[PDB]
Amino acid sequence: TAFHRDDHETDMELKPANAATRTSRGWHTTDLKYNPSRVEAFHRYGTTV
Amino acid sequence: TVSTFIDLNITMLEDHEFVPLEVYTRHEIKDSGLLDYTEVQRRNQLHDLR
Numbered sequence: 117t118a119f120h121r122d123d124h125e126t127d128m129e130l131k132p133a134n135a136a137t138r139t140s141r142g143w144h145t146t147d148l149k150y151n152p153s154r155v156e157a158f159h160r161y162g163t164t165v
Numbered sequence: 166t167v168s169t170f171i172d173l174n175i176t177m178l179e180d181h182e183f184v185p186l187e188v189y190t191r192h193e194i195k196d197s198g199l200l201d202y203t204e205v206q207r208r209n210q211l212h213d214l215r
């Protein structure tokens with residue numbers, strides 16, 4: 117089981133995929149990846165869905 | 166009138182045109198493969214920009 121940005125569960129708006137040539141339609145919800153904020157000399161895990 | 170001649174009937178062989186004919190075109194042959202590798206690649210390399 118996995119969460120987005122290690123955050124609570126949320127229903128998100130399905131956004132049309134950005135334009136491309138010779139491709140069928142698509143839809144996503146998140147445009148960017150999540151990476152943890154910085155604390156020095158540590159391992160930190162960041163989840164995107 | 167009676168005739169001393171002997172008949173002979175010659176008609177020229179008529180013209181005939183040959184139209185181009187193909188059982189399978191090369192596009193059907195390219196489509197024969199269940200997976201055209203190139204098209205799969207082009208589709209799958211658009212995921213980040215899409």
Ligand SMILES: *[C@@H]1O[C@H](CO)[C@@H](O[C@@H]2O[C@H](CO)[C@@H](O)[C@H](O)[C@H]2NC(C)=O)[C@H](O)[C@H]1NC(C)=O
Nearest residue numbers: 168170171172173174175176177178179180181
């Ligand atoms: C000389 O040429 C042909 C025979 O080789 C005959 O011409 C055809 O005759 C048929 C009937 O047998 C007709 O339906 C056609 O209209 C005729 N023309 C063609 C181009 O086929 C012709 O009759 C022969 N001459 C004589 C006196 O019989």
